[PDB]
Amino acid sequence: NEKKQSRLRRAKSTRLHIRALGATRLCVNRTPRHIYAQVISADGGKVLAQASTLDASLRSGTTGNIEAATKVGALIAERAKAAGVTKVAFDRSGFKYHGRIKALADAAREGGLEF
Amino acid sequence: LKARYNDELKAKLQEELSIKNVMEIPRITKITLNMGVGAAATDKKLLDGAVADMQLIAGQKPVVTLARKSIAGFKIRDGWPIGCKVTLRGDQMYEFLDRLISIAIPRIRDFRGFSAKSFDGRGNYSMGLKEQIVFPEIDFDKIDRIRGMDITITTTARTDDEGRALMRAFGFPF
Amino acid sequence: STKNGRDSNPKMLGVKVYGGQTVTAGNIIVRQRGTEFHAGANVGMGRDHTLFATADGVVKFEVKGQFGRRYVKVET
């Protein structure tokens, strides 16, 4: 069971630093089947925009690789631009910045969020 | 082994020990090989000979083990090499297991050394095999001082009886 | 003859601004050898564990978190 405990332990420092800095957070989650990304306000208890591969437009695909993550990033970027958030801090939630999450981050960056 | 185990021993052990679900059928996860070569500090060559021995016996590179804490009764220091260890999993573990069980056991002069006991109370078995000989490498000639191996099989088995059943199914003598 | 008779100079540690007082940015709030109090919002920590205010406002003490740590913060 130490897998998830280790992941949360790894995420703690980045989350606390972002909270102390006071910026808007962009948080991601990854499972073998799906990927999720939500934009959370500074206080940490309200969300502005959200996106995931559970979306009806995208749920029909493979949902578990880099290609799906690319459109997830594009979707969250376009939805966050609607809410009006521009500057964000990326929170990898204890994952490595590699592969699917890196693709999602690059897609959001091309979408228009600067980070 | 691999496929042979998956084909026979799964269902055989399931019906033998009367287990309801497949997910808890006993398996072997890893095998650890150790040489605790104490007092390597004086010679510095027996240890690198031991790492070579491990390299030939198992097709994996060994990692030297540093001491933890210093004891006056012995001569070991805070963090200096005092041993060597290797872990084997996957297909390499099945390989080493079969090339050991089939070949090495008849080779040694004594027999019945490994009792049906010595499980650690949770289904993992430990044995000691003496002399680096009886292994697919060169004999007493072209080797350095003789050495012994410690072999531990760690299993998903919960009880000693289930561990014993899994080992005897593969062909562990006792 | 005694082998004792030494002591060190005083250091003047302790709380300098109490709850309810108004501060300006840069005011020192706590002098402390270790981290008996921790830095909350608008409060910074120096290299010797001194706590100071980084904005104008009112000082407030509290107990917070899963470890029961004592925090001091500044409300603007």
Add this chain to the structure above:
Amino acid sequence: MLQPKRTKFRKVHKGRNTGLAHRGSTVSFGSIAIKATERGRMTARQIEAARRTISRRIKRGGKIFIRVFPDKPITEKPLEVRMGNGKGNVEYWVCEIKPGKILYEIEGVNEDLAREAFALAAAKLPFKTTIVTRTVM
């Protein structure tokens, strides 16, 4: 001569003896006991003398519980020495006694013999005492 096997420090401050003994004022081990009524100090020699008197009188027919231990050291100056120049040297050990503190308990004898032994012992002590017996509450 009771005395601690080892101590964290060798010399201690004088202090003050105030208050009552709410702890250690109930008969717990035996059936009859002797307890102090006014405060004072008790030395290891006094403890030994009272114990010897009680044991000799009751002829070791029961069991004696001692509930005081002398864990406080007392210093003195070497005599003909002037004031100053450091604290003195440890001479003897004492226990501080507050009113209500139980000193000795006896188990397994008749009350007449226990009371006679306690009366013999009370003449060796530097403060007033009294006799108590166990009670439900």
Add this chain to the structure above:
Amino acid sequence: ANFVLNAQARAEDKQGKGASRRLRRESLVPAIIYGGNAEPVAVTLELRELVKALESNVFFEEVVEIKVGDKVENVKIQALQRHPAKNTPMHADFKRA
């Protein structure tokens, strides 16, 4: 029934440190009564009656009756305080039975 204690109400102006010391100087004993479904009740007892009752052994295991005028309570002894040096009872607790 067999054990009966006459008591008088102890009021707020009779509660406290100085009030309790004055009561004991008048040879009285403070007591409290608590238990299921009712609020605590503070009462005053007679020292001689309490000592006489405590001398008997059945007092600690039998239901006793406390009478404050018309109000009657059936209780068991729960806790007792004694002076460390004189062994005089100083305060009593009674749990409703």
Add this chain to the structure above:
RNA sequence: CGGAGGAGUACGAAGGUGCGCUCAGCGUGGUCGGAAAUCACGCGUAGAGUAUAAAGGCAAAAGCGCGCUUAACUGCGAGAC
């Protein structure tokens, strides 16, 4: 001229940063190998450690590793003790 202890140093990494990891104890088995070297699995648990005396601290560990490096910078500095 009360009761107890330390200092007159060390380190180009034992500094910076990014990423990563948790101690100590006991119990089982396992060659020499045992009271106590290393290996594997459990139990309860901060009692380990922090260059050095004690105290105040230490999970975003301030404890422990690896890669790259010189912010062990220049001019200052609102405001405080």
Add this chain to the structure above:
RNA sequence: GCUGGCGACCAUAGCAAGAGUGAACCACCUGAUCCCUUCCCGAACUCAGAAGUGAAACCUCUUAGCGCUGAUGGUAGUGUGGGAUUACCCAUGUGAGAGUAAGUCAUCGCCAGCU
């Protein structure tokens, strides 16, 4: 009414024991071709996937078993005035710690899926 994420709070909320959950989600799960990875090991990190299982794990439910919370009354201490000096007493104000009765198997907020 379930599932996931992120917070408020930090034991009345925690541990322990026992029992359930697979439609979806989550979890184990397949192998290691490319990205990446171990002072050795696809064990962890990573990628490419759904043939199996809810066994383990995570959640939810029950229990006062351990733990935690906790009165009222009394006692200790104590500021001011007075009386005494083994450190107490009176007037007045204040008031623990321990223990007793009793309580507890939490409570809220934002978003997204499934009925």
